[PDB]
Structures are given as structure tokens and as C-alpha cells.
């Protein structure tokens, strides 16, 4: 077995389990060459780059999927969130560890993907979804197995087979991803780098990434096998930087 240690935390991730390192890039700190913000950043290090375990969700035989926006997922988690409120600009990578364990007598398969810039569409084509609909602080917002109607002016068109992005759900594999096949898998680990067109961005106004966990083969199990299979997401900021110190934000 192996030990992934970030600050006060330490994960146990099989031994042969493959860590998917984003687009081949390991998160690193900003270089003086590509920067413009003239104020010296704050690098919390141990206090920020650590494993925050978000809320777990239940995988049931009909579950369509779950998703989290990342900057707005760790917004309420510790000193990461505090620096997030107090600074105008931020920059972060992540180590995402999605854990699900069943028994030999269970079956199922989840796609765990990291969509950068997951701009989602609305149910009413004449409106954009609302902040609460797109965002759930450590409270996974759920995909749906059905189309939501034109009614409900400000909701996300959560039909899973379009991933709420107007694409084929079967093509999300271009984004860094793993599969949790209960037959042979216990967890998925993805190390995402800073993905953005600008060197630093605000952490409340822009969710640079979006984690999605979508069961492609549904859970099933014989009578007697434990029927409550939870999935627990644990994300860790990596090489976090903040610039532009100021008042906090009511966001």
C-alpha cells in the first residue's frame, strides 16, 4: 500500500492504483515570467494544500450522477476558503480522490472526470441557470435521468446523456478521468493542474474546474448484500497562490 500525504492528511490508495496526472502536468507555482500581479502572493502551504473530505452521496440503483464546481466546493472548507474570501485573485491545482468500496457480490461502474470550464446550459433557452443551481458548496448537485422542461426558468438542463453541456456523455473521456469499476476498483485519484487562459483568476466568480461522477453501468447486487453504497469525494488544493489582499467578501 502507498501513502499520499498532504499536510495533516494521508490517503491510502491501493498500491497499483493509477494516479491520473491531468494533462500530463503536475501542479506548480506561478513563474515570474508569466505573472503580472505585482503584489507578493500568499502561499499557505500546509494549511491550504491538504485533503478536505466533502459530503458523501449515496449511490442507488437509479442514480444518474453528481457534480461539484471546485472553487465553489472548497469555498467553506477551512483556511483555503478563508484566503479565498480575503484575496482578489487565486490560483490552485487539485488532488481529487473519489472513494467507493463495495463487495465482491456488488457491481457497477462510475466515470470520474474533471471538466475544465464546464459552462452548463439552461432549461429555458432564453435564460442562464441560477447561481444556486450551478453551485452546491460541498453539496453535490445531481444529474437527472430525464429532461427538465422549459418551465422552471432558471435551472440546469441536467439530462445525463448530454452532461448538461450539449455533448455526448460518452465523450467526456477527453477530459482527465478514471473509472471506478466495483469489480476491480476502490478509488480514483486525479491530480489536476491549473487550467485557465489567465495566470490568476477570482475564485468566486469563475469555477475553473468541475468534477463529475456519472455511473455508466448502474449498481446492482443480490438480496442480502449491503444496499447502501456511499461515494466520498476528498479534494486537496495544491500549490495554491493568492494575490490582492483586501477586505473579505460576503459571497
Amino acid at each position: 500500500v502507498r501513502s499520499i500525504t498532504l499536510g495533516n492528511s494521508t490517503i491510502t490508495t491501493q498500491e497499483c492504483a493509477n494516479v491520473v496526472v491531468g494533462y500530463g502536468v503536475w501542479p506548480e507555482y506561478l513563474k515570474d515570467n508569466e505573472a503580472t500581479a505585482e503584489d507578493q502572493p500568499t502561499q499557505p502551504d500546509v494549511a491550504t494544500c491538504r485533503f478536505y473530505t466533502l459530503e458523501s452521496v449515496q449511490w442507488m440503483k437509479n442514480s444518474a450522477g453528481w457534480w461539484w464546481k471546485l472553487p465553489d466546493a472548497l469555498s467553506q472548507m477551512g483556511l483555503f476558503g478563508q484566503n479565498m474570501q480575503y484575496h482578489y485573485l487565486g490560483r490552485t491545482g487539485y488532488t481529487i480522490h473519489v472513494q467507493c468500496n463495495a463487495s465482491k457480490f456488488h457491481q457497477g461502474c462510475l466515470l470520474v472526470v474533471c471538466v475544465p470550464e464546464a459552462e452548463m446550459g439552461c432549461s429555458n433557452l432564453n435564460n442562464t441557470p441560477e447561481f444556486a443551481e450551478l453551485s452546491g458548496g460541498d453539496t453535490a448537485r445531481m444529474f437527472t435521468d430525464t429532461q427538465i422542461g422549459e418551465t422552471n426558468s432558471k435551472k440546469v438542463q441536467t439530462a445525463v446523456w448530454n452532461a448538461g453541456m450539449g455533448v455526448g456523455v460518452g465523450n467526456l473521456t477527453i477530459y482527465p478521468h478514471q473509472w471506478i469499476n466495483l469489480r476491480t476498483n476502490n478509488s480514483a485519484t486525479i491530480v489536476m493542474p491549473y487550467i485557465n487562459s489567465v495566470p490568476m483568476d477570482n475564485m468566486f466568480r469563475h469555477n475553473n474546474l468541475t468534477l463529475m461522477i456519472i455511473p455508466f453501468v448502474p449498481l446492482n447486487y443480490s438480496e442480502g448484500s449491503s444496499p447502501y453504497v456511499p461515494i466520498t469525494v476528498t479534494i486537496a488544493p495544491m500549490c495554491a497562490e493568492y494575490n490582492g489582499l483586501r477586505l473579505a467578501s460576503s459571497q
Binding site: G22, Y23, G24, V25, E34, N171, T173, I174, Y194, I195
Partner: peptide, 22 residues
């Protein structure tokens, strides 16, 4: 100036070579 954004694509075959569910 330019920035080293991860995941630069140079050819569409780089995309076509990626497994996708059928």
C-alpha cells in the same frame, strides 16, 4: 505574452487516439 496552458493540442489525431465510450 504567451502562457504555458496545459493540454496543448497539435493534431486532431491526438483527440481521435483517446478512448471514448461506444
Amino acid at each position: 505574452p504567451e502562457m504555458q496552458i496545459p493540454g496543448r493540442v497539435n493534431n486532431l489525431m491526438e483527440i481521435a487516439e483517446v478512448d471514448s465510450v461506444v
